[PDB]
Design a protein around this ligand. Structure first.
Ligand code: ZN
Ligand code: ZN
Length: 98
């Protein structure tokens, strides 16, 4: 399973505001750094390979669908659980030969 912190209360909810880019834990969304670019914190979503060991990617690197080859899973904002990504695989041409 997974760790589900209790709550039953919605307060101090964030708001649409411009935030600066600084190298320091600003939000509780540190989770795990990227294994490719090594972006930390990972402002973008949090992805991980369910086939490899200690492997995690970021929304950015994910946009490239490089590691997508394996079964990855993305999480959601607090009070949520991982999710099974769709088989979104466009790259089918494969210029390998032509
Ligand atoms: Zn990355
Ligand atoms: Zn993998």
């Amino acid at each position: 399973g997974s760790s589900g912190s209790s709550g039953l209360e919605e307060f101090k909810n964030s708001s649409k505001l411009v935030a600066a880019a600084e190298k320091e834990r600003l939000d509780k969304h540190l989770g795990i750094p990227c294994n490719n670019c090594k972006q930390f914190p990972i402002e973008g979503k949090c992805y991980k390979c369910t086939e490899c060991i200690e492997y995690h990617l970021c929304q950015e690197c994910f946009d490239s669908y490089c590691h997508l080859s394996h079964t990855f899973t993305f999480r959601e904002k607090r009070n949520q659980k991982w999710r099974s990504l769709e088989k979104r695989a466009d790259e089918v041409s494969g210029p390998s030969s032509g």
